[PDB]
Amino acid sequence: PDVQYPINTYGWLKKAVALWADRDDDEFVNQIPNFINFAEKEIYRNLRIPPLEKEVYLDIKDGVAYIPPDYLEAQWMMRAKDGTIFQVTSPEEISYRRQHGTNQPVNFARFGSRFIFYPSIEADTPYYPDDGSPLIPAENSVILSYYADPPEFHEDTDTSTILTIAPELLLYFTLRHACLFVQDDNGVQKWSALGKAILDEMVEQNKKQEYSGSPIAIPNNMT
């Protein structure tokens, strides 16, 4: 096969992979997609960065506020009102807060598929989103910043930022499972090492991007 200089996406990548493993037979190609579904997962299982982050409003309603399907991990959480940050704790503490009602430091916790907040908050969303209402961002309610499970590819012309930015990664990491389907293990080691060494670059990029501007270790607030 052949490809274009940039590999925008699947429609070409699933071929370039066959290429980089020169012997592209059918028993092998038709599982290309599977190798890929493996690799992206092996990645996203632990990769965390902005581009997949999300803004979103919530509906607390009795503090049963439910967790979205797409959720993986939360970075921060707050209100659109006066910018109040929540913080997180365990049930074993929030329950005490309940048995000791008197609330400014808002806490919350993870009860199965549920989020609890100590004070009976009432942020809100509309009913199912037929919508017909921006509603000042749903009454400027809490807003969440969380990493979300990206969609598995399902189409050749389908795409993702990753390919705009860092496709060789996917290539190597799927070659990994491709060189496992058929026993060429030295190639495996090489693919894998390179995937990891490509990857850690990204997280370090992000780390060096985070906390820039020389902040003090912690502005000690008295109040």
Binding site: T89, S90, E92, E93, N220, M222
Partner: protein, 50 residues
């Protein structure tokens, strides 16, 4: 005038160090963290890690 300035600053520097130290921090990654168990406020804990 000078005495009030120095004594104010020195006591101010004294206070924040005290306020930082008195209410203490701890350190442990997710590995062996035991987030559920550690949040217990009882001084007589019943669960730890190994």
């Amino acid at each position: 005038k000078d005495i009030q300035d120095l004594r104010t600053a020195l006591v101010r520097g004294y206070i924040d160090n005290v306020n930082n130290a008195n209410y203490g921090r701890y350190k442990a990654l997710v590995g062996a963290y035991d987030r559920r168990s550690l949040l217990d406020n009882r001084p007589g804990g019943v669960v730890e890690m190994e």
